[PDB]
Ligand SMILES: Cc1nc(-c2nc3cc(Cl)ccc3[nH]2)c(C)c(-c2ccccc2)c1[C@H](OC(C)(C)C)C(=O)O
């Protein structure tokens with residue numbers, strides 16, 4: 001599968017919102033607790049993500065997530081396209097959160113601990129952290 | 142230079158705080174506008190950074206930044222060490238911000254645009270985004 005493809009979705013936990021980006025070819029996650037599910041937050045998160053990785057196209061399970069001109073502007077500026085055709089790893093991330101949730105006071109901290117655990121964990125075999133970097137390097141030179 | 146080494150500092154701009162992490166071997170930046178320069182923010186940012194990259198040791202230009210047990214806990218949990226001996230790229234990032242600052246309403250958005258521009262820009266020669274991934278892949282298998 002193509003190396004510039006990400007998937008972006010929100011989950012709710014403790015009445016708060018978690019934005020979850022999955023790098024599809026690799027399983028690597030970035031995530032962030034946002035105070036509300038707005039186009040503002042999604043636009044911002046997209047700019048952050050695009051500064052960090054080569055992001056060509058973004059899929060979602062909720063297309064209306066992407067309809068605001070606020071979001072369309074971010075994609076425009078960073079040069080991102082939306083999907084043309086078409087786990088959950090939200091599941092196990094949500095498993096890992098509940099697991100570490102005692103280890104921290106705020107949800108946001110548990111989230112980051114869970115992203116840490118998820119991206120490092122060897123599946124086998126490489127880790128999602130190792131696979132992303134390999135995929136993206138393999139695809140450069 | 143060693144691939145797990147990052148440098149973390151804050152700058153102030155428009156009475157707000159920008160936390161800037163530089164991957165030293167590569168020049169790659171992650172950055173974030175934080176509302177105040179606390180141990181809470183730095184601890185959190187460190188957890189985020191460590192979930193994303195292999196982070197062994199972190200340097201700073203302001204050692205007191207790292208003295209809180211709040212920060213020491215984050216490093217403890219993620220397995221990070223502080224420095225044992227020892228651009229600014231804060232300079233040009235601050236150049237890029239002023240450059241794009243019209244292109245956006247908030248500082249935080251200008252920051253991310255500037256991180257995007259900085260990480261992509263080919264120096265020559267690869268980009269900081271390409272060098273980080275190469276360095277980290279080169280160092281794996
Ligand atoms: C609020 C908070 N306060 C403290 C904390 N720092 C302390 C310093 C002292 Cl002296 C006493 C008690 C203290 N408790 C700590 C040590 C953490 C922390 C927990 C796990 C890993 C890293 C840091 C958090 C943490 O929140 C962040 C800072 C990461 C945003 C959380 O959600 O649990």
Ligand SMILES: Cc1nc(-c2nc3cc(Cl)ccc3[nH]2)c(C)c(-c2ccccc2)c1[C@H](OC(C)(C)C)C(=O)O
Nearest residue numbers: 039040041043044069070073074077244245246247250
């Ligand atoms: C506050 C804000 N509002 C709008 C905006 N969205 C609109 C939608 C409509 Cl219908 C009309 C005017 C609009 N203005 C936009 C389009 C942006 C934006 C600017 C550059 C790139 C991506 C998005 C921002 C932006 O803030 C973030 C959303 C990125 C946090 C900023 O700081 O300039």
